[PDB]
Amino acid sequence: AYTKISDVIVPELFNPYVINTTTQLSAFFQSGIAATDDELNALAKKAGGGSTLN
Amino acid sequence: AYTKISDVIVPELFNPYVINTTTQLSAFFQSGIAATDDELNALAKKAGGGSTLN
């Protein structure tokens, strides 16, 4: 026969991983919501925890 | 009665060759395809030959 590519055994190959990124762009910013006050901060930091003020 | 050109020999002439150029302009460049990566290089250079990676 031949040297015959049909005989000699063919390897396979690989390369490292690559991170995919799912895309639906999330912005809807900037808008409401924004602009933290000091008051909702008075909700934010302890002490005197929730529930919410008035 | 005359020198009578029919009596006299007319030569012929030639000049060297000139290269023709077939024209259908091939560009469709630049575009995909472009921009070789390093990975398809990992296919490119030996060792660890084909067939192709994943």
Swiss-Prot record, chains A, B:
It is found in: Virion. Belongs to the lambda phage major capsid protein family. Capsid protein self-assembles, with the help of the scaffolding protein gp11, to form an icosahedral capsid with a T=7 symmetry, about 61 nm in diameter. The capsid encapsulates the genomic DNA. Interacts with the scaffolding protein gp11. Interacts with the decoration protein gp12. This is Major capsid protein. It comes from Bacillus phage SPP1. The gene is 13. The chain holds residues 2 to 55 of 324 of the full protein.
